[PDB]
From a paper:
BZU3 encodes a UDP-Glc 4-epimerase and plays a key role in controlling cell wall synthesis during the morphogenesis of maize stomata. BZU3 formed a homo-dimer, with each protomer folded into two distinct structural units, the N-terminal NAD+ binding domain (residues 1-189) and the C-terminal sugar-binding domain (residues 190-355). The catalytic site was located in the cleft between these two structural domains.
BZU3bzu3-2 failed to form homo-dimers, probably due to the frameshift which would be expected to alter the structural folding of its C-terminal domain.
Numbering used by the authors:
A (entry chain B): 7 to 200, 207 to 301, 307 to 347
B (entry chain A): 7 to 138, 141 to 201, 208 to 300, 309 to 347
Write the structure that this text describes.
Amino acid sequence: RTILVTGGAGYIGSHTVLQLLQQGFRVVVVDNLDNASEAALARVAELAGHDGANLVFHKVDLRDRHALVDIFSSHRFEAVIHFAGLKAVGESVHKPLLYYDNNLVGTITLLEVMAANGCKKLVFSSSATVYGWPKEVPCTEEFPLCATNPYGRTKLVIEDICRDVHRSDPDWKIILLRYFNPVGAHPSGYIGEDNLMPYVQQVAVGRLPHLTVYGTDYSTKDGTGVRDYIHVVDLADGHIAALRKLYEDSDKIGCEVYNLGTGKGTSVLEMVAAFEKASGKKIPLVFAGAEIVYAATAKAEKELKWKAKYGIEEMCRDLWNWASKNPYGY
Amino acid sequence: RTILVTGGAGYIGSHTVLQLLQQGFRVVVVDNLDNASEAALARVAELAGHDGANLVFHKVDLRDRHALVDIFSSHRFEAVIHFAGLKAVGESVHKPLLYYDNNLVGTITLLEVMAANGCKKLVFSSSATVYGKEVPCTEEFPLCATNPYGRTKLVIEDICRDVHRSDPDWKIILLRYFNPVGAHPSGYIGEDPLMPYVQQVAVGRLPHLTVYGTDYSTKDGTGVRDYIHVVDLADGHIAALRKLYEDSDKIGCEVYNLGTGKGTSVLEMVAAFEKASGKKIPLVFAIVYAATAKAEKELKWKAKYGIEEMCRDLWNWASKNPYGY
Ligand SMILES: NC(=O)c1ccc[n+]([C@@H]2O[C@H](COP(=O)([O-])OP(=O)(O)OC[C@H]3O[C@@H](n4cnc5c(N)ncnc54)[C@H](O)[C@@H]3O)[C@@H](O)[C@H]2O)c1
Ligand SMILES: NC(=O)c1ccc[n+]([C@@H]2O[C@H](COP(=O)([O-])OP(=O)(O)OC[C@H]3O[C@@H](n4cnc5c(N)ncnc54)[C@H](O)[C@@H]3O)[C@@H](O)[C@H]2O)c1
């Protein structure tokens, strides 16, 4: 039983193939590796132990169609999990074509090769920046959508391409997942990343002088911004939950949308406190000049049979655990 | 002065490249003849006469990055008019990927080579189908993609707005238009695929026209859409390209409406064609406007032909070429 995972060498993707491997799956990963290193897949393989053999890695770009058609004709892939993409808001503005070319062309070629190789089961990882900054929280899947930046637009376009493909061929079964701010690392502290918590962690180890808190007078309990965080191990279990919805309850759902997350938001000060407790270090602050945004996960918990298991305190534990062991990444 | 025109071999593309050659512009046309035929460019060079020797034609696909960078490296360009694209709303639904591939990827590649070889002036052939209310559709009208072909147009219409934010040196004009009708008054070049259908009825290949919607909120009870002479459309882009050159400080990524500012019913157009052609159009029965005030104010452009000249030129090109080229 094989699953193909694009951008599997990345942060969310590497934690994905590990849980996949551990739960009896052959995982084929496709990565350009411009945003990551091979070591992450060598370590996810080690963490998988005897299941390390099941992981197969292809250093190939999703836009390359010939290299991609070869992969899809070498296995019957039960489904495809699409992580490949670029995830930098500031970078997407100065270089919008660089984002539109990578995200849009990469997905289109992917959807084409899949349809041509009889693989029409997809799970796409989408960003919850599509809701924009709304007046009302919690954000439900019925909330209106808007694009704050080219990165957000490129994500919202893919969602529309997925919807259009579904209406063109009812054989397509797509699940679109939206989520907020993955944080943490594998409890072993052997794989991890390389937003706020990264900045907190680099100043907790000494690399940075302090954490600058932007905004101290918001309409929140403490006055600092409230965002939606989610344990990365929890989020990588969310993408798998959808894959089971595709395997068991496929008939019910066609190109459905489930947004993931803990369901509650926490503030910068609430989050710094949760990291000082787990870390034992004390991050200095310097005060400088949306107040709240978070995801309503009621839908996911009901239809997808999924619920986050880890709170903010174990997120910082694991983040500190991996980072303190690996200060220079890989 | 050299202009690059993509999709210049078909209809609006063929007519515009003709009126660019006629105004002293060395024009390089890029087209992979998917929907058009090469004869349309040969016969455009003829109608240009002496200026016909300024038509450089490269049968290449915009999604072929290496083929495209050769064309930009040799010719030092001044601007690009992007007609290239797939227009069939019908198959855009059943084959959406084919549309996102050809349109989105072909456009993103062109934009990359342009900014690379130092040429950041573009005129885009958008579509007013992005309007998806109030009878006159202004540019500020809320945008609404109704199908995959419409969303490719709206996506490309957002990518340019994003490109301009990243590099202020980019000057772009987005031209939204709908329902081009007619051909060159000579009748030597035109469209070779509602007017095309009523035409085939007059020329005998079709038995009758099918009027879809005999009840509507209109005088005739039939739908009312906007129509613009293809020759009006062609030099409508010329007015845009004229703003990129003469007044390209004020403008950023501007969007303009091209049309006559008036709407025609279905029975009015067929009634018009029955006069201009003399042949009657049997019918078997089964509102969109353009706010041209902006374009005629800041572009110095107003459609010069009317619905009578559209059927005249369309019946002229069609009776002289009943089987295309
Ligand atoms: N060039 C290509 O087309 C291509 C091909 C194959 C793989 N890749 C790879 O895909 C990998 C993606 O991994 P990554 O570590 O950059 O991203 P990631 O693993 O942190 O996230 C995976 C995907 O989730 C998206 N995302 C949505 N909301 C997010 C949030 N709140 N935080 C973070 N990501 C969010 C990202 O845009 C990304 O596309 C990269 O390593 C890249 O090298 C690219
Ligand atoms: N090189 C490439 O990238 C590439 C690939 C495939 C096709 N093509 C070419 O693209 C050209 C497309 O031109 P065409 O022959 O369709 O002529 P056309 O005039 O119908 O289409 C060209 C432009 O006019 C617009 N248009 C015209 N009528 C319209 C209507 N009723 N509704 C909405 N928009 C309308 C379209 O938006 C399009 O951008 C063809 O000549 C084909 O050969 C180019």
